[model samples]
Target: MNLLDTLQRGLADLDAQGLRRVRRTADSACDAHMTVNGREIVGFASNDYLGLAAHPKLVAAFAEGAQRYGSGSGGSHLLGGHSRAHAKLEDELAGFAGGFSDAPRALYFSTGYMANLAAVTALAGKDATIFSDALNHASLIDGTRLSRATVQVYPHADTATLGALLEACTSQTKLIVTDTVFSMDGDIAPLAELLALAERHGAWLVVDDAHGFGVLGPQGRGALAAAALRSPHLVYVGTLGXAAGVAGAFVVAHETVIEWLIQRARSYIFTTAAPPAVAHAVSASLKVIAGDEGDARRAHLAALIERTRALLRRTRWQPVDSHTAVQPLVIGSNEATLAAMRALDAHGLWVPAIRPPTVPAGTSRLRISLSAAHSFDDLARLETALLRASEEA
Candidate 1:
């Protein structure tokens, strides 16, 4: 069968599952506000936690580099497209990940999705068994499936349940993978305990800190910084586009692991590198990230959380416990979730309702994101929308 025929049937299944995806037009000039579907709205659904996506320094660096290097990378890293800009960003990324420590070397991919694909499949083989969290992001779940490994789906962060699977796995088992901060739930993983489990089982641990990095922990080192657990066996993968407000993904590990990926990773070997401008921009972003008054941002976010939560408390909002910026208010069904989202839009606010496949069954929610960019007034508007949603639902 041709590609269309295959996808035609697959699309039917997706429709049945209520997992069909769509494209929406958006232009976010500042981190706190955006024009979506031709209407400007408070930006509560973005991953830009530090509110640096539109920062002047990064924009200037990106523009300057774009003029020097073309918009496209032109070729894959090993071929001819690798530039000094890419090299410097990789160096900075390594420094941020504590590369000189016992951790393995660091490598970069064009994007975090590719990074996950490269690390997981290249590292784990078909005979190898892997443990995956129930709530891991789709990129990770797809990467694990693509690894051809027999996967054990552990209940989300239940160390005891995970321990049982770890203990029961065959000797051929290779690794355990999970997201540091679950994108949907916004809860953190028990990395300290998970690392101990992986070490005890002699399995490699890969923590995808996509959502947490640059937004959580001291100096924005992400979940590892927050958890205060650094084991040699643990590998940290971070995205540069979120808090860094640039693009690309970095894998921080031992020199040996870095060397292995340079040779073995298909995604890194086959795809064109990210734009040199984006890499250069990421270098500047790291400077801001390091000095990021994360304490102040964290404090500001806490107050906003309290303000948002206190308002949510008066309604029938199904509270999902997460202190991180990605807060979800469960609406339970597609109708209710979408209705709530529509109501928010009518009121000049834009909070997206997360439906099936993005979330598991009966867990449809309005994903309310907070940012360092949002003012008290913005959140207050969100509060009013929530109150309206409660009544409409």
Candidate 2:
């Protein structure tokens, strides 16, 4: 068969398992109410936990920044593309992680994926070993593969097992990688214990705070601050596009490690710098996140999470244990998961079905993500719709 025919065959296989994905265009901004394909939906399907995506301040900042520094950055940071806005955001990002480690420095990336790839591959060379959580994000897994290191996978948040694996490793350089908050499972990693293990083994621990930043801890300082886990060998990656309501990602680490990455991380070295305007907007977001407004948003989100858990408890499907905005309801089959999602959508609720290979087979689920922009009534409506869908299922 031709290459085009092979693509069609692959899509058909996905459809057979109810694992096919289709993109939906959002006519509205990233908010609780999404205009998807011209249909208004009360969505519980975004990572915008603090509801800052459509914030006026961020919008204004981006507009002003674009006017000051044109839309495109001319080249990579090594060339002439680095701007004052980028430098300022990096400084602010480093400051946020300052209390955890000394002389914190940050590096900017156009995306969390790129940042992850750089952090893992750059830090863990072929002679090194990477012990990663089994359920870590694909970016980390890919990064580990690219590093060509001796990779070991431990059970999800299983620190004791991780410790055992670390004790057995004889590699010159050891690295531990995990997601601060598991995106699909909605559970948090054992940050404190992981750090302890890293310390014991003299390993570098890399925590991807993609879902935790802008939603966890005091002033959204991230999971490390929330867990009060700090080490000179720790590297924290935070994404700006989600709760920060901007477009970029930053990595904070000890100054020396960050400097080494700037010099050696190929993803960082080869890519063009992110737009100056996005960095400027992210800087404004940092200020907002450190103020009273951020406090209120966090409180509101906490209440929403509590209410969701309580409401979901009454349903047939069990909501996983998660303190963060991500909540998963496992349905056990791709067909049933898709059915439940469609049922909820029929009732004006929009939650996506997550299936293999994104998750383990037979644990197909509906990932119900919440935002501070979501109202009590919106949640109540969702609860009602979920109940109805559960009955139908």
Candidate 3:
């Protein structure tokens, strides 16, 4: 069939351009170090910032939850799958990460993508307009498109451009969406300014904190709390799979907004609820994230971030000015970025290369994701690898 032929040709084109992606198998649990493709390597590609993915408490809790909840939720939330675990986790999430609103509420979702889609579509539609950040995650972008709203993409963290767009927007319902922490770039958004814009325009500000929750703010409250910004119109989305070391995402907002999502968000209404055991595990994760152990992990992660920042600066390549656990070094061209990745792999480090579609053209990079599981010795190994790669180049 022509369709099959077209797919083959397209894949060939991708390979020719060095843009084809391949997955490497990880034989061990998500950690700072892991066995990939039967070889042990230092892993700087995981989003497990707090290094709890293999935590004994989390592992035990998951097992206990499965035993208690019988492994499944059995239906969609509206169709009676909502378990006591789900309800309790939602309440805890709202209290922990929804401090931006006085009457905070939280809704759980299977993934951040589903949560973002649900929030955007339910809050804004054809008649409304969405002001999106240029560097926002694909989930947020998809949500805006799915809503069929008039989308205006402002330059990355460029609130000045966003303000102009918001001021010019005549749509009755406006939604401003962005990532609290830009995933690939590793830079924090100017959330305070964006929130101010949302307030001035009477627009709903939706922030996807996939990379921030459980690794940011006081007791890991997230990016909004880190900046001390409060607003009833703010919609906060956080993922548990990253820093929380588990799976699932939650959207938090004022009670009314949450109720609206529950009723209207199709992604939520149609999909089967995740296993109650997962939610149960997340509750235990939250307990750890807000406790002293979480604080210690965060402290260690902060030190790693600082050390990595300094190391990246020492490199000849361009480094994104970031203070988060994500660190990126721009190595223009797809081939060159791949070369960097392979070069590091040869040194027993598993840093990944970011290419087109993930980032803009001509800005391919190596994304270095840090975790509390990493040690000073690990970072030193990374430094040695990078220098060796540079010399080889």
Candidate 4:
């Protein structure tokens, strides 16, 4: 078959499976409500948990940074793209996690995907064996593959199974990777248990706190700090584009580990550093993240979660158990899930339907993301729309 025909066939197959994704245009900045595809929508489809994506402080800092440092980094970090903004943010990020004493250093990447790739491939070398969670983000999964390491995917959050896998591993280098908060299910991983397992097996533990960072723990230190699990073997990766409402990701680890990545992590070493203005904006974001305002936002976010969960409980659709802002309401088939999403969209609500293979085949769901910017009335409206949609489905 010709290459063009093969590609067309693949696209057709994806459409048939209800797995094809379409991008919707947003006319306004990231917020609780925005204009999408020429219609106003109350959006629950974003990862802006803290509602800081368009915050005035970050915006101002970004502008000022652009004036001072220009619009771009111009080159890779090793090639003089590293600026004071990036340096400052990295230092602050390391300090925010109290990494100075142990983890000791931090390195920034253009995206969470790159950060994960850098950490996994750099730490888990060619001879390494990685024990990963089945529910880990695709970035980590891809990183493990790139490392050319033997990977064993244990059941999600199943420490006993992970422990067994670790025991069975014979590779000289062992690494354990997991998402602190499972993105699709909105459930947290067993960080403390995983740390213990890592300790027992002398394996390195890498936690991608993309969903939990700037939303969980004291001062938003993330899942590892929230669980009070600390170890030299632990490497923490968090995204700035989510709760921090800025674009980039950082990896916090022992200085040696970071140094090694600087040398060997192709994703980090080969790519141009992210715009310095973005890094400066991230620095301002970290201040808000560690301050009293951040505390208030967390409280409001928690209230939103509680209220939304309580409201969702009334629906016939089963609400998956979650303590985070990510809430999933399971609808069995892809067809029904898309139908519900459309119904809710007709009511001006934008909740995305997650289908296979982003989720398991039978667990298609409407992912409702709550934020501090969302009002109680917003959730009430969502509940009403969701229930009506469920009935329509």
Across 1-393, the per-residue lDDT of candidate 2 in tens digits comes to: 699999999999888878788888899998999899899999898889889999999999989999999998999999989999899888888888556887789999999999999999989998999999999999999999999799999999999899999999999899999999999988999888899999989999999999999888878899988988778989999999888888789899999999999999998989899999999889889888888999999999999999998878777887899888998988889999999999998988899999999999899999999899999999899889888888877
- Would you list the clashing residue pairs of candidate 3? none
TM-score for predicted model 3 compared with the true structure: 0.99
Candidate 2 yields a Cα-based lDDT of: 0.90
Local distance difference test scores for all models = 0.82, 0.90, 0.92, 0.90
Better of 2 and 4 by TM-score: 2
Against the true structure, candidate 2 reaches a TM-score of 0.98
The TM-score values for the models, in the order shown, are: 0.93, 0.98, 0.99, 0.98
Evaluate residue 217 in candidate 1 and report its C-alpha lDDT on the 0 to 100 scale: 75
Tell me the deviation in Å of residue 163 in model 4.
1.0
> lDDT: which candidate is best?
3
TM-score for predicted model 4 compared with the true structure: 0.98
Off by over 4 Å in 1: 1-22, 28-30, 99-104, 292-295
Show model 4 residue runs off by greater than 4 Å. 99-103
The weakest ten consecutive residues by lDDT in model 4 span: 95-104
Candidate 3 ranges with C-alpha deviation above 4 Å: none
Error of 3 at 76 (Å): 0.3
**Mind giving the per-residue lDDT tens digits that candidate 1 earns over 1-393?**
698999999999877765666666786575688887787888777777778888888999988989988788889999988988888877777777753247456787889999999889888887898899999989898889889798889999999999998888775656989999888888899998999998899988999999888877777877887787767677788998776777889888877778888898888899888888888788888888788465566667767777766666766977677878788888888767877887988888877779877888888888887788889999888888788779766
lDDT for each residue of candidate 4 in 210-298, tens digit (9 for 90 to 100):
99999999989999778987788999899999999989999999888889999999999899999999999999999898899999999
